[PDB]
Design a protein around this motif. Structure first.
Motif, mmCIF file in Angstrom:
data_model
loop_
_atom_site.group_PDB
_atom_site.id
_atom_site.type_symbol
_atom_site.label_atom_id
_atom_site.label_comp_id
_atom_site.label_asym_id
_atom_site.label_seq_id
_atom_site.Cartn_x
_atom_site.Cartn_y
_atom_site.Cartn_z
ATOM 1 N N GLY A 57 0.850 -1.191 0.000
ATOM 2 C CA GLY A 57 0.000 0.000 0.000
ATOM 3 C C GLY A 57 0.879 1.232 0.000
ATOM 4 O O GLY A 57 2.115 1.110 -0.028
ATOM 5 N N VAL A 58 0.248 2.407 0.038
ATOM 6 C CA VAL A 58 0.945 3.707 -0.002
ATOM 7 C C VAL A 58 0.528 4.659 1.132
ATOM 8 O O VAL A 58 0.770 5.858 1.050
ATOM 9 C CB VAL A 58 0.770 4.417 -1.377
ATOM 10 N N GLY A 59 -0.052 4.120 2.204
ATOM 11 C CA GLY A 59 -0.428 4.911 3.374
ATOM 12 C C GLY A 59 -1.932 4.767 3.588
ATOM 13 O O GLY A 59 -2.697 4.733 2.623
ATOM 14 N N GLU A 60 -2.330 4.724 4.864
ATOM 15 C CA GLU A 60 -3.702 4.491 5.250
ATOM 16 C C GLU A 60 -4.036 5.378 6.429
ATOM 17 O O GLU A 60 -3.136 5.719 7.204
ATOM 18 C CB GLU A 60 -3.875 3.031 5.664
ATOM 19 N N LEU A 172 -0.671 6.271 8.517
ATOM 20 C CA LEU A 172 0.360 5.277 8.822
ATOM 21 C C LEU A 172 0.717 4.441 7.602
ATOM 22 O O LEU A 172 -0.026 4.413 6.630
ATOM 23 C CB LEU A 172 -0.092 4.372 9.992
ATOM 24 N N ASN A 173 1.861 3.772 7.689
ATOM 25 C CA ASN A 173 2.254 2.734 6.716
ATOM 26 C C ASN A 173 1.725 1.395 7.256
ATOM 27 O O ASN A 173 2.179 0.922 8.310
ATOM 28 C CB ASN A 173 3.781 2.732 6.614
ATOM 29 N N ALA A 174 0.759 0.804 6.583
ATOM 30 C CA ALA A 174 0.116 -0.411 7.111
ATOM 31 C C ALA A 174 1.036 -1.617 7.236
ATOM 32 O O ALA A 174 0.895 -2.433 8.166
ATOM 33 C CB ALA A 174 -1.111 -0.778 6.301
HETATM 34 CL CL LIG Z 1 -0.228 1.546 3.645
#
Ligand SMILES: [Cl-]
Length: 526
Positions: A57-60, A172-174
């Motif tokens: 992913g790219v951030g959540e 956050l970075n998951a």
């Molecule tokens: Cl992420």
């Protein structure tokens, strides 16, 4: 007999945030007292994780609930922030959702995490309504509109872990979060970790899952199985055949094109909120982490092809030519929706295995936390009585999903955008849930209120509906025969909010200045 055996053997199928948040919340609730793991704990929790490389992913984003989840699991806030590339999120700012964009017309509103000021004393919304042309709802009732516009944080370096001046969740970075949780849960909370594939799922005579036959770790028996296998929903959807309820006829969006975006400078300012900027055929998310941003265009493939969607993404990024050609955005296609139940027989689905839609309002981690925390609070005593608990959990789950769909759809339905078919189609009745149609009619005549929600512990409170409805300039008939005493209370509360906003605006740090000190010194424990 077997049906009276306590439920203690818990098998989580899948890792990631869904699996590890579940493991942590269960272990912390049943197996730990004052941060100490019991010598002979109630629950025997095993997590089976695929050895296959996970989708990146790219951030959540999260809701403020995540502060509580982290604290309950036993994670230190400084450790979390440092290890998960996290920043503070104070809500969602919606840009260009209301009108067809004009170069000289600002179009932006905030959906803050803070509740309206004085909410325990008086719902200010109907008292604000007569003043809508002079001041925004969010400015009138909270301090976060002004503070987030200034790029300020929700707390100071002297504020205790997980405490706040204004309520906050995180960006956050998951993957980094899942790694932190794996470490914490296995090394401190006694969770057994198996890295392997499941070759067979075996039922008992009554149709419950009894055991899993792994590819190289033998047979793993359990009493309750948590499906954290993602959208493939291998246990709940596939093995147990729980039907999927598509919501694409409501939301339309079934694509996302996502990319990470560096900041221009090593100390570029970090935004206080998630940004959501409406486009001709969807909207673009923009999540600010300390090191970079995550950006994605959520869109409808029945309104645009992928070539054109990519152009739109690149326009938002301000890139073209050779610069654009080196970019590698990633495309995902989905059927947005949810499983009819999250809990069937002795299997509960958590995360994408239960459902998934576009990340408008960041429902994904919130649903994981809700489902895991609910299971931890309602651990069935035994199999005999489990269905009483699963039935009421399913009813609440169904309430949550109806609310999520309606709340997300609200963001589209009250736009005045006219240039694009996509936006016009979003206002057509066949795409609007009957429950939301009823609310839209009622809200012409009175403000949203707590009276609109019948059940306990809703995911979104009435305030969220107020922030969106009035953020987008929806007209509600003014109350008549207003009580002077309440008008006077309202005015006092409006004044107090104004004074608090001013005080905080002078004292809070920017996000980057705060995060720099969190890195170097940390928030205190107390
Ligand atoms: Cl992420």
């Amino acid at each position: 007999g077997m049906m009276q055996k306590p439920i203690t053997e818990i098998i989580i199928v899948g890792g990631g945030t869904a699996g590890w948040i579940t493991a942590g919340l269960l272990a912390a609730e049943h197996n730990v007292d004052k941060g100490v793991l019991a010598h002979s704990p109630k629950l025997n929790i095993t997590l089976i994780e695929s050895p296959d490389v996970a989708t990146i992913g790219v951030g959540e984003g999260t809701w403020p609930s995540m502060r509580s989840t982290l604290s309950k699991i036993g994670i230190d806030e400084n450790d979390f922030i440092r290890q998960c590339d996290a920043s503070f999120k104070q809500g969602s700012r919606f840009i260009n959702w209301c009108k067809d964009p004009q170069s000289n017309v600002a179009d932006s509103y905030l959906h803050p995490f803070s509740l309206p000021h004085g909410h325990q004393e008086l719902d200010l919304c109907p008292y604000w309504l007569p003043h809508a042309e002079q001041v925004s709802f969010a400015e009138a009732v909270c301090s976060q509109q002004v503070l987030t516009q200034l790029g300020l944080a929700p707390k100071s370096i002297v504020t205790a872990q997980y405490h706040f001046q204004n309520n906050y969740g995180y960006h956050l970075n998951a993957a980094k979060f899942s790694q932190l949780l794996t470490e914490h849960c296995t090394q401190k909370l006694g969770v057994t970790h198996i890295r392997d594939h499941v070759s067979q799922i075996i039922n008992n005579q009554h149709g419950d899952i009894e055991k899993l036959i792994t590819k190289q770790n033998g047979e793993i028996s359990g009493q309750l199985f948590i499906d954290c296998t993602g959208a493939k929903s291998l246990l709940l959807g596939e093995h147990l055949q729980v039907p999927f309820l598509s919501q694409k006829s409501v939301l339309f969006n079934d694509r996302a094109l996502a990319i990470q975006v560096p900041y221009s400078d090593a100390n570029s300012p970090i935004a206080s909120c998630t940004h959501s900027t409406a486009q001709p055929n969807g909207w673009i998310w923009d999540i600010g982490l300390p090191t970079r941003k995550g950006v994605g265009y959520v869109y409808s493939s029945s309104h645009t092809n992928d070539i054109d969607a990519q152009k739109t993404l690149f326009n938002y990024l301000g890139v073209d030519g050779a610069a654009a050609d080196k970019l590698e955005p990633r495309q995902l296609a989905i059927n947005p929706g949810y499983r009819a139940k999250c809990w069937q027989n002795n299997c509960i689905a958590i995360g994408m295995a239960a459902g998934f839609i576009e990340p408008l309002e960041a429902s994904a981690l919130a649903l994981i936390e809700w489902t895991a925390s609910t299971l931890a609070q309602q651990l069935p005593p035994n199999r005999m009585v489990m269905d009483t608990i699963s039935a009421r959990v399913n009813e609440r789950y169904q309430q949550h999903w109806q609310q999520i769909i309606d709340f997300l759809k609200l963001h589209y339905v009250i736009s005045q955008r006219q240039e694009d078919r996509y936006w016009r189609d979003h206002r057509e009745s066949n795409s609007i849930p009957d429950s939301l149609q009823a609310m839209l009619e009622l809200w012409r005549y009175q403000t949203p209120s707590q009276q609109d929600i019948s059940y306990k512990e809703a995911l979104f409170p009435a305030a969220s509906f107020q922030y969106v409805l009035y953020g987008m300039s929806f007209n509600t008939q003014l109350p008549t025969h207003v009580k002077p005493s309440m008008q006077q209370l309202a005015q006092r509360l409006f004044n107090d909010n104004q004074q608090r906003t001013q005080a905080l605006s002078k004292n809070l740090p920017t996000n980057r200045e705060l995060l720099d000190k969190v890195a170097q010194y940390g928030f205190p424990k107390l």
